[PDB]
Amino acid sequence: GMLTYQVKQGDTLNSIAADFRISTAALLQANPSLQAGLTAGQSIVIPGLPDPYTIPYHIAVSIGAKTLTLSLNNRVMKTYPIAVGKILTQTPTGEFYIINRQRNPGGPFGAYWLSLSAAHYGIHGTNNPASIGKAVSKGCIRMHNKDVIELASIVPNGTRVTINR
């Protein structure tokens, strides 16, 4: 299948390409309709990704509880503690997808980086384990290295991530 994205107010061709880590050229090639511009509500396809609804895994993040919940077929498997965005640089809310990943990025990013479908944002490890469970990040979601590693080993690219208050 394919990943369908719905255009939101204030999206541009460039910003959408950016959120999904692809070139605008590739986005246009996959969506000839986009030659004529964008409109809020418009469904388009993001190339390179499977249909997220066909992936039985689902990730729910709660900013208030500082948790990331992994479900398989709407049954919780595992709850993890996480760090979230500080008060003036919060973790965005809404529906996202894991888009790509890099193993062992190191530094403050720890054992793994999993890109989310919002530019500059992802789920990553940490080299500051004391930060986990606190609102101290500049926006990304931080996990213990062992947790992000386990997480990455299970969920494939395209996995739904729902971030709530």
Q: Residue numbers of the site for a second copy (CB under 8 A)?
A: 12, 14-15, 17-18, 21-26, 47-48, 88-90, 92, 100-103, 105, 107-109, 113, 119-120, 127-128, 138-139
Residue 120 among the catalytic residues? no
Minimum gap (Å) between residue 124 Cβ and a second copy: 9
Shortest approach of a second copy to residue 22 CB, angstroms? 5
CB nearer to a second copy: give 92 or 94.
92
Is the Cβ of residue 47 or residue 81 nearer to a second copy in the bound state? 47
Residues sharing a CB contact under 8 Å with residue 120, sequence separation 6 or more, in sequence order: 139
Q: Are 64 and 135 in contact (CB under 8 A)?
A: no
Question: To the nearest whole angstrom, how small is the minimum distance from the Cβ of residue 102 to a second copy?
Answer: 5
Q: What SS3 state is found at 28?
A: helix
Residue 144 is among the residues annotated as catalytic for this protein: no
Neighbours of 28 (CB within 10 A): 15
Please identify, using beta-carbon distances, which residue of 67 and 90 lies nearer to a second copy.
90
Pairing of strands 94-103, 141-142: unpaired
Q: Return the number of the residue (58 or 142) whose C-beta is nearest a second copy.
A: 142
CA-CA distance, 112 to 152, in Å (whole number)?
Answer: 8
Rounded to the nearest 5°, which phi and psi values hold at 49?
Answer: -115, 145
* Residue 22 to residue 99: CA distance in whole angstroms: 10
| Minimum distance from residue 81 beta carbon to a second copy (Å) | 21
Active site positions, annotated: 124, 140
